[PDB]
Design a protein around this ligand. Structure first.
Ligand SMILES: N[C@@H](Cn1cc([N+](=O)[O-])c(=O)[nH]c1=O)C(=O)O
Ligand SMILES: N[C@@H](Cn1cc([N+](=O)[O-])c(=O)[nH]c1=O)C(=O)O
Ligand SMILES: N[C@@H](Cn1cc([N+](=O)[O-])c(=O)[nH]c1=O)C(=O)O
Lengths: 299, 33, 181, 48
């Protein structure tokens, strides 16, 4: 009815969602991605989980490799490419004055082929030794500069853990404004996970969103500055939807499970549990997930 | 990390230093010969 | 001589090849520096499509029963192989399978539950690793006799323990806090 | 030190330093206590 899973109101002591529809006799058996929680077991019976999952992190589209072309003019700067062809024509104009008009055109084409790097005139000899040394430091400094740009590229470690989001602020992060996910961070006592909550409590702009869709888009439109925290099942599912610009990063934070829920003392209870276990050992449960997540995935 | 013309600068002076020393030994070879 | 035709081919081709060897040099210095390892097998699919690397499970218990009654295409292809494996790919104890993996120089894999697998990865001399996604999705539980009065509370206990997250810490303590790696 | 174990670490077998890690509630320090306790060989020393 109210399009909700199920949780108890703090005021009216009123159970809403499907858990509501089960305890007030409106339904006989719920089959949905309902998280088996503590306070739920106290009002409704669960079976074994038919799908194990956890709270995880979502990232924005990373640019695909690569520009390439403008990673050659970058190591050796634009203003140093110029100077090495200003003294290049400054060496071949000093070597040209050591050697009537066309006799200086075949000699400016003979000094510009010796300037293009590869007798004992002590003049241009201390040109060929100090220009060669000049182009030795340059090639040694281009080789070293490039080895630090491919090193820095392999060092930029993607946001691996929830410890990483806590270790900075440049990337905003929040969860659903209601539901289990927000209730974890709130209730939790764990050192890291609390430090994340104290952040999200005092967040400007607000890091909380209203829907699962509103968060997917916020991730999808913040140029990689917002991370949405949600359950793994939905996270690895949005990784398969066009335009395929959301990625599941790092292991989950906890270990929940989705199970079939029946009212307390339902005759349908016990067989359903056997069914889930039967379906699990047969592989129908693994096959069904690969069906809906990956076999119809656009990636 | 970003490279600078700094270190590169002090090698442009040895070049034009070796160029200016070259035009110094060039002008003495056409005097002797 | 100074043919400004082919001479500018020299200087330009010489500069092109200067860059190429510089770009092979600095990139070779990238794989030797940071140096990240990559494992062969990515899934049970990469074990069914070759037999150069042997693979078996324990000789008794859950895991062997899994491949047996498996109706899945790839696992059945793994089971049919392991039934008639020459020599035998099955092991009697867990200590046998681990040391067989270790003393096979990389020519025998051992299939077992995900728990102990990431446990052995933390034990010396740390010559074992867990690769590829798990095959199935099991779970340990606490078992009580049919109709036990212990039943419903012990169940409520585990839940409370999981939400309070003592289970997470307890795993990390015995698996990683005391891990030798 | 808490992140690794290849380099052993311990304190005095009795006193304020030994007690500090024993009663510590902080994440890092408590983990260091759990190591120094069950350590083998013993990380504690009788004198400075
Ligand atoms: N199904 C959950 C509720 N639930 C579901 C999702 N979702 O669908 O992945 C979520 O992001 N957050 C949340 O609290 C429950 O049963 O508590
Ligand atoms: N836990 C299993 C028994 N069990 C345990 C391991 N193990 O320790 O990871 C194994 O490799 N094989 C097996 O059958 C069971 O009780 O069915
Ligand atoms: N100052 C402490 C005693 N005390 C002194 C040293 N020390 O000598 O630096 C020490 O290593 N450990 C310790 O408990 C006390 O008064 O409790």
């Amino acid at each position: 009815g109210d399009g909700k899973y199920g949780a108890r109101d703090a005021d009216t002591k009123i159970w809403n969602g499907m858990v509501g529809e089960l305890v007030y006799g409106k339904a006989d058996i719920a089959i949905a991605p309902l998280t088996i929680t503590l306070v739920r077991e106290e009002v409704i019976d669960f079976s074994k989980p038919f799908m194990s999952l956890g709270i995880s992190i979502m990232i924005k589209k990373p640019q695909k490799s690569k520009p390439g072309v403008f990673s050659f003019l970058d190591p050796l700067a634009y203003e140093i490419w110029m100077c090495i062809v200003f003294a290049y024509i400054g060496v071949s104009v000093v070597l040209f004055l050591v050697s009537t008009n066309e006799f200086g055109i075949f000699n400016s084409l003979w000094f510009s082929l010796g300037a293009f790097m590869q007798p004992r005139s002590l003049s241009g000899r201390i040109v060929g030794g100090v220009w060669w040394f000049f182009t030795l430091i340059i090639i040694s400094s281009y080789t070293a500069n490039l080895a630090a740009f491919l090193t820095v590229e392999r060092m930029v470690s993607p946001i691996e853990s929830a410890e990483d989001l806590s270790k900075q602020t440049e990337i905003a992060y929040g969860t659903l404004d209601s539901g289990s996910t927000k209730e974890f961070f709130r209730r939790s006592k764990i050192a890291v996970f609390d430090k994340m909550w104290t952040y999200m409590r005092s967040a400007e702009p607000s890091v909380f969103v209203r829907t699962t869709a509103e968060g997917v888009a916020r991730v999808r439109k913040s140029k990689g500055k917002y991370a949405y925290l949600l359950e793994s099942t939905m996270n690895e599912y949005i990784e398969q939807r066009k335009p395929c610009d959301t990625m599941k990063v790092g292991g989950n934070l906890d270990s929940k499970g989705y199970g079939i829920a029946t009212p307390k003392g339902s005759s349908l209870g016990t067989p359903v549990n056997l069914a889930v276990l039967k379906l699990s050992e047969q592989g129908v449960l693994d096959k069904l997930k690969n069906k809906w997540w990956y076999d119809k995935g656009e990636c | 990390s970003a490279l600078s013309l700094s270190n590169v600068a002090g090698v442009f002076y040895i070049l034009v230093g070796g160029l200016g020393l070259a035009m110094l030994v060039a002008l003495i070879e056409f005097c002797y010969k």
